[PDB]
């Protein structure tokens, strides 16, 4: 509260560390469904069903231009990629399995880097 500060966690390297994690996810062999925005004109259902599309290239642009206020907003967008993937794809499909694999991959890098 006013004039009562909790001790300050060091956040000076967050930007660099999120960029590294993003690079590792970009180069994972199962990243291909998530590298670019889904083509809303060519994929039936997607525009109407998925209220907030997100993909790795859009995350990269936002990180490179100061559009994440902090750590957690970056993590919310990464998770959104995988939450959208589960909404639109069967668990037993290549894309569905790619999604589950990439989420598991991210969450371990996230824990090891920050927790």
DSSP string, the chain: -TT-PPP----TTHHHHHHHHHHHHHTSGGGTTTSS---TTTSTTHHHH-SS---HHHHHHHHHTT---SHHHHHHHHHHHHHHHHHHS-SSSHHHHHHHHHHHHHHHHHHHHH-
Which residues ranging from 18 to 47 are in contact with ligand 54U (CB under 6 A)?
A: 33, 38, 43
Stretch that binds ligand 54U, among 16-24, 71-79, 81-89, 107-115 (CB under 6 A): 81-89
Q: If binding is defined by CB under 6 A, does position 95 make contact with ligand 54U?
A: yes
Q: If binding is defined by CB under 6 A, does position 88 make contact with ligand 54U?
A: yes
Binding interface with ligand 54U (CB under 6 A): 33, 38, 43, 85, 88-89, 95
């Amino acid at each position: 509260s006013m004039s009562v500060k909790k001790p300050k966690r060091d956040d000076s390297k967050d930007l660099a560390l999120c960029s590294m994690i993003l690079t590792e996810m970009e180069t994972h062999e199962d990243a291909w469904p998530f590298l670019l925005p889904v083509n809303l004109k060519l994929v039936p259902g997607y525009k109407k069903v998925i209220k907030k599309p997100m993909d790795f290239s859009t995350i990269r642009e936002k990180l490179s231009s100061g559009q994440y206020p902090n750590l957690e907003t970056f993590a919310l967008d990464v998770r959104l990629v995988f939450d959208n993937c589960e909404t639109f794809n069967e668990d037993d499909s290549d894309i569905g399995r790619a999604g589950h694999n990439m989420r598991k991959y991210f969450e371990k890098k996230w824990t090891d880097t920050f927790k």
